[PDB]
Amino acid sequence: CAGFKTSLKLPNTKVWFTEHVPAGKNITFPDNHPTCTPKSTITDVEICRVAMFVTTGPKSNLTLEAWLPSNWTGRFLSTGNGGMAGCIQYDDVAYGAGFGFATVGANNGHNGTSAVSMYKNSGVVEDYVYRSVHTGTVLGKELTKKFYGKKHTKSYYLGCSTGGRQGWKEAQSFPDDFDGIVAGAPAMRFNGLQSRSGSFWGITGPPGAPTHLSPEEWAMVQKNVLVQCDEPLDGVADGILEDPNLCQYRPEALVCSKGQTKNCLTGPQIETVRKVFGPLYGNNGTYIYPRIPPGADQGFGFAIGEQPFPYSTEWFQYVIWNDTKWDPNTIGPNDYQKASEVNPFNVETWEGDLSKFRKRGSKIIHWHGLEDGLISSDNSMEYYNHVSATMGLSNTELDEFYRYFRVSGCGHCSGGIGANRIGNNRANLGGKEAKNNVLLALVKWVEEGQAPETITGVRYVNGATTGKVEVERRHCRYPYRNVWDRKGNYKNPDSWKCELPLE
Template identity: 40%
Template sequence: MFHFTNKNTAGSAAAAASTVQAAATSSAIAAATSTATSTSATAAATNSSSAGQAVSGCQALIQALSFPDQQVYVVDCEDITAGTALTLPNGPSNCNGGSVQIDLRRVTLDVVTSYASSNYVEVWLPTGQDAWNGRFMATDNKGLSGCPSYDDMIYTSSLGFSVVGDNGGHNNTEYLGMDAQQFLNNNELVIDWSYRARHAAVVAGKQVIKTNYGRAADYNYMIGCSNGGRQALQSAQMFPEDFDGIIAGSAASDFNHHIDWSGRMYVLTGADASDPKYLTYDDWVIVHNEVLKQCDEPLDGVADGIIEDSTICDFNATKLTCVGNQTDNCLTFQQTSTVWNVFSQLYDPDGNLYYPRLSPGAELYSSTNGVLHGVQGHVKDWFGAGVWNDSSWDPLTLSQTDYTKADETNVLHGNVSSFNSDLSAFHAAGKKLIMYHGLMDPAITPENSQRYYLDVARDMGLDHTGLDEFLRFFRISGMYHCTGGIGAWAFGQNGNAQNGTSNVVWDIVNWVEKGEAPDTMTGTKFVNDDPTQGVQMERHHCRFPYRTTYKGSGDSNDADNWSCEMIDDWQKCGVYNVPRLC
């Protein structure tokens, strides 16, 4: 292991760092040092590389590395070839996944973040002649994840970026990265996951890149979706100098209220069919068909199962209730009440909006992914381990008391809500932000991203032309959570979506580096979601506050038969508006 510390704090800080390493969650990672390169610690602490000079290999890189103002352990450095399968050293196997697509240098670090925590960081450096495009890309954590986002790292490194990923300051232990039991009685880990681990990884990663190539990256970017979208927005809010361009997808912003909303669904829908208010999958099919009947063709002119703008769907659930002796294709009164509740906003006791409704059109997929069926693991983990420090907390007891407690701990948790609408420092620095959200997202309602856009406009005193200078928000009809769906969902947001007409990664690059801002995001839907089978449909998804509008004739699967029309009342968001977004 190679331990570096700022020479100005080499005394007590070094001792503290060794204590941290013994106690921190990443102690398991420290065991991986037996596989690290054999260069001596003394040599490693000596910066033998002159400024502006690239290093030739792992040994030289380790010898040259230094980390001003950070305490960093270099765990390993290895040159790996395209096709190498990825595993997380001494971490949970459910973090493993995929194979690198290019030759690269993989540097692993343990970055001390507090007296009781540290962050596992990976820095990927494309090798080979002209392999690096001179740009840096930071990736995210999904859910309450303790895993690096290897899928995003594989994807963006294949595009030529130097890439940084991390475990959010704690190791995951369960499937899908939703486990946060390590948060229990350890608020330093919560702060790491909230924002600190990401920023520390970025600072350390930039130093590795600069040392390896002999120069800093020309431009710095971040890509994230879901909780990663929240992290991306929080980076813009808290550290506007970290990135030149940010892609924030399906953001779990206003995080505490999002978890309130998610947990509330379990209370509203019941645990199973023994509860009279519970709906089976077949019942949700009935609901979905009625939603489409009211809000698909009547609102967008095309009967294709895709509601082009679900925010204007004022769904009337009363039509679902069985009448007289009717028993088929209808719901009981209790079940209809459940539907009304699911499509209602969450308010505080004074009538202030906590969180918007489930997006009409997303209900069927929501019934299969846990939102409207059973309890979501991250709800129990967040309230039990993060908010109450009580692993026995029962999701069925969720109430206003829990909502209030979560709000009270927001600052303690590192402002995890990530809903600060003042982006003036980000704007003044000339940075750019692309937001996107699928309108059939079953996990995080897209209306919340629109709500954030409106908050930024109101609080910064800007109209849409002012926002267009640095923030563009795209509503993706027919897309589920971050990816997939029945609509034109592929626009380069991840490795499975890179074969369409548009690529959001290059959109943010062109906006930052050439001043070419995207007005639309062309989504592609392949036959059976398989690019080898050809294109099924495309759609030019308009930036808000424009609505993607069918021209009235021609093949609706052809993007050119749709236009972008300004929404006249786009800033209205009050009590009597559907949806209410303020």
């Protein structure tokens, strides 16, 4: 480990340091960009921490780390990124190491949560779109070989949001990198997601505009969504929409009457909720991106709040229009069209043809929280249906290599009020068996050939990190719907059945 510092020679790579770290230690990241998170993480197992610098071109480069466990299963795991960052997901790297995966993570080609480094620098864009995760996986596999004296057995990827788009970019365009992929809440159709996310500030206008809803007005809308769409459509008043596809919300239920001004929506605010819970279309009637589903309150206030959305604003300024003065206030169809046409390095990540991934025997667990208000879960079932149409494969054919799990009462990669903890990361960690942990479910599918039918999530007593299970639920693979039996305790998973009517 100490000596690896000098023996490890990787192409275009400077090894800064190596570091023995024992089980238990609060590893600290004093050189992490100020905007990056977290500032430390616990390793539950003993590792060699390898910190590299990798040159991807004349003015582009990664920071890559490998955390290599003393007790190695033979497995390699890549992690991925978040937002427009910029930041190694150290908690995911620790998560991986903790299960005996030799785990890598890179910073996606720049430091920090801003995409300003992308401006007039397509190599930094290229590392963001595909080249950081890919390159990290190649060198990851190389150095894993050189440290242990043999080749990894199976290659895995784990990522969420931006990291979920990165997982799909791998299945779509780098199919040999990974034998197994968990892709969470993926930021795929990425230009459409930036257009969708940017569009909300144009729809609402600023604070005090007639069209604008305060945070308290949005929470009033969400309460009225549960009145219309919760118990009436799934039979269980848990504040969780088990299948938002059945919910078409009517904001006119809240219309202000003669001289009512409080606890109600005006005409312009009703138009705003209809647009936010509606699809985005553009020039010549071209479809851009689905609605935010009703009930999806988790992370809702990031793009739909009191100021313009940073991720979309920087994309349009730095990457699409190359104009630091582009104004998020006047976003419109010409923007959505230009982003689709520029589409750097095919960051759209909307390829339907998974031939090569399927054929080599690779498996992908796709999943999305139904309570996610930052990345619409509707975009994920549109991708599944796109794959089915493009490849000419029914859901039962796709079941062989690609399953997509709709997790009710789960937010953006974690949180939410349901049985959300499916084991995609530490924050969303539940149990540690294949049936209730998506990373072990991926290992079991790749290694044993036992595909997940359902993925189990749990909520602990009082929404705590651990303890007695209060709610457990077997989340359904699309296009199955979770159906309550109308008799059993709704908190008992045995009270529910994943259903797909064929007659």
